[PDB]
Design brief:
Blueprint: E1 4-6, E2 9-13, H1 19-23, E3 25-29, E4 34-38, E5 54-59, E6 64-69, E7 74-78, E8 87-96, E9 107-110, E10 113-122, E11 125-130
Antiparallel strand pairs: 1-2, 2-4, 3-4, 5-6, 5-9, 7-8, 8-11, 9-10, 10-11
Bound molecules: the ligand Cn1cnc2c(NC(=O)N3CCC[C@H](C(N)=O)C3)cccc21 and zinc ion.
Zinc ion binds next to loops.
């Protein structure tokens, strides 16, 4: 679990969005596993606007932060799950690191701010949904 809170927006994994997220929907994209909903309170986070390929992510299944080298946002095949059919997930970045299904929503940060959130994993890999191209989150 986990979310990014920036301005009057809450960014979550689309497959973990609640009834309240859908009732206050701003934007969602099944191909990216992202959903953004509106909030009444001002958020605590700031978004990176950079091309960093190194950062640190929070892994809830280890209660620890780990440093990672991650690939550029790209179209990657993701096997079928209870949440989606077999498809290409876009804007996904992979890295070597530990992740379990419940780790989705953990934040990946670089020195400039929030880069993305955990969205996929398995096999000693961890995949992050990028949010750096969503410029409208800042206004
Ligand atoms: C070990 N392991 C297996 N599975 C994992 C997982 N879940 C995972 O990849 N998917 C299920 C939830 C939706 C994800 C999507 N974006 O399509 C795909 C996350 C993290 C570690 C995982
Ligand atoms: Zn950066």
């Amino acid at each position: 679990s986990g979310a990014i809170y920036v301005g009057n927006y809450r960014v979550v994994n689309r497959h973990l969005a609640t009834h309240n997220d859908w009732a206050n929907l701003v934007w969602e994209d099944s191909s990216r596993d992202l959903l953004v909903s509106s909030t009444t309170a001002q958020g605590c986070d700031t978004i990176a606007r950079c091309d960093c390929q190194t950062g640190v992510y929070y892994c809830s299944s280890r209660r620890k932060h780990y440093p990672v080298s991650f690939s550029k946002p790209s179209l990657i095949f993701v096997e079928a799950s209870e949440y989606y059919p077999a498809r290409y997930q876009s804007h996904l970045m992979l890295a070597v690191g530990h992740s379990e299904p419940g780790d989705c929503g953990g934040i990946l940060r670089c020195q400039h701010g929030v880069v993305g959130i955990v969205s996929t994993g398995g096999n000693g890999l961890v995949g992050f949904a990028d949010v750096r191209d969503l410029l409208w989150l800042d206004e």
